[PDB]
Amino acid sequence: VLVQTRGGNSNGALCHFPFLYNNHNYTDCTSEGRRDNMKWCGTTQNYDADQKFGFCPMA
Ligand SMILES: *[C@@H]1O[C@H](CO)[C@@H](O)[C@H](O)[C@H]1NC(C)=O
């Protein structure tokens, strides 16, 4: 699969996995920070120390 994003805090980067999100190593996309339904993903390897996310346009 290929999760690429463009607009989040990555200024145009490909989401990566696994990605620590608030001490929550997520090896995929998650909608815990959304209130609609889609799912986003971190673009860094340490969200707790990076603060960079993106979207997960995929299935
Ligand atoms: C998440 O993975 C990183 C890389 O191995 C590790 O340093 C960190 O402690 C892990 N955190 C959790 C909650 O598993």
UniProtKB/Swiss-Prot annotation:
Subunit annotation: Mostly heterodimers or multimers of alternatively spliced variants, connected by 2 disulfide bonds near the carboxyl ends; to a lesser extent homodimers. Interacts with FBLN1, AMBP, TNR, LGALS3BP and COL13A1. Interacts with FBLN7. Interacts with COMP. Interacts (via type III repeats 9-14) with TNFAIP6 (via CUB domain); this interaction enhances fibronectin fibril assembly. TNFAIP6 may act as a bridging molecule between FN1 and THBS1. Interacts with TNR; the interaction inhibits cell adhesion and neurite outgrowth. Interacts with FST3 and MYOC. Interacts with SVEP1. (Microbial infection) Interacts with S.aureus FnbA.
Residues linked to a glycan: 25
Residue intervals of the Fibronectin type-II domain: 10-58
Function: Fibronectins bind cell surfaces and various compounds including collagen, fibrin, heparin, DNA, and actin. Fibronectins are involved in cell adhesion, cell motility, opsonization, wound healing, and maintenance of cell shape. Involved in osteoblast compaction through the fibronectin fibrillogenesis cell-mediated matrix assembly process, essential for osteoblast mineralization. Participates in the regulation of type I collagen deposition by osteoblasts. Acts as a ligand for the LILRB4 receptor, inhibiting FCGR1A/CD64-mediated monocyte activation. Secreted by contracting muscle, induces liver autophagy, a degradative pathway for nutrient mobilization and damage removal, and systemic insulin sensitization via hepatic ITGA5:ITGB1 integrin receptor signaling.
Disease implication from the record: Glomerulopathy with fibronectin deposits 2: Genetically heterogeneous autosomal dominant disorder characterized clinically by proteinuria, microscopic hematuria, and hypertension that leads to end-stage renal failure in the second to fifth decade of life. Spondylometaphyseal dysplasia, corner fracture type: An autosomal dominant form of spondylometaphyseal dysplasia, a group of short stature disorders distinguished by abnormalities in the vertebrae and the metaphyses of the tubular bones. SMDCF is characterized by flake-like, triangular, or curvilinear ossification centers at the edges of irregular metaphyses that simulate fractures. These corner fractures involve the distal tibia, the ulnar aspect of the distal radius, the proximal humerus, and the proximal femur.
Disulfide bridges in this chain: 15-41, 29-56
Free-text tissue specificity from the UniProt record: Expressed in the inner limiting membrane and around blood vessels in the retina (at protein level). Plasma FN (soluble dimeric form) is secreted by hepatocytes. Cellular FN (dimeric or cross-linked multimeric forms), made by fibroblasts, epithelial and other cell types, is deposited as fibrils in the extracellular matrix. Ugl-Y1, Ugl-Y2 and Ugl-Y3 are found in urine.
Protein's recorded name: Fibronectin
Domain of life of the source: Eukaryota
Cell compartment(s), UniProt: Secreted, Extracellular space, Extracellular matrix; Secreted
The record's account of how the chain is modified after translation: Sulfated. Forms covalent cross-links mediated by a transglutaminase, such as F13A or TGM2, between a glutamine and the epsilon-amino group of a lysine residue, forming homopolymers and heteropolymers (e.g. fibrinogen-fibronectin, collagen-fibronectin heteropolymers).
